[PDB]
Amino acid sequence: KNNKSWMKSEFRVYSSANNCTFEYVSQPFNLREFVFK
Amino acid sequence: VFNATRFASVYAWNRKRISNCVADYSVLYNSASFSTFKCYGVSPTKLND
């Protein structure tokens, strides 16, 4: 939008996060296939 | 947990989550400052394994 670039403006995920018990965060930086268990 | 500059009052006793990490007594227990180290459900040597 006007700036000829792409950037994040929304993180419309959640409104509270009271008791936190696990956290991990990566080091910072087609077909995609996944299995979850 | 221990080296922190200003503790809570008992009336305001803090509490930490310790998780996803390795918990040694190897330093902790052997620091000669601890006037008390009293364990009820396990003996002090069996905490590491």
Ligand SMILES: *[C@@H]1O[C@H](CO)[C@@H](O[C@@H]2O[C@H](CO)[C@@H](O[C@H]3O[C@H](CO)[C@@H](O)[C@H](O)[C@@H]3O)[C@H](O)[C@H]2NC(C)=O)[C@H](O)[C@H]1NC(C)=O
């Ligand atoms: C609180 O933080 C203190 C600073 O990191 C830490 O003190 C350090 O304790 C270790 C022993 O666990 C000492 O290690 C050295 O001991 C002798 C020194 O001659 C050497 O044989 C060793 O190879 C090693 O170099 C540090 O000297 C000591 N540092 C200071 C400033 O006192 C405490 O152990 C921490 N305590 C807790 C409970 O977190």
Ligand SMILES: *[C@@H]1O[C@H](CO)[C@@H](O[C@@H]2O[C@H](CO)[C@@H](O)[C@H](O)[C@H]2NC(C)=O)[C@H](O)[C@H]1NC(C)=O
């Ligand atoms: C997670 O946080 C909530 C938020 O307070 C805690 O829920 C309280 O738990 C006590 C004990 O069961 C109840 O008497 C309260 O009415 C609860 N309040 C609410 C808003 O839920 C809960 O204890 C926390 N979980 C853990 C494991 O600490």
Ligand SMILES: *[C@@H]1O[C@H](CO)[C@@H](O)[C@H](O)[C@H]1NC(C)=O
């Ligand atoms: C344009 O990109 C910049 C980041 O380079 C950002 O600050 C700005 O808010 C963006 N504006 C629009 C309308 O996308």
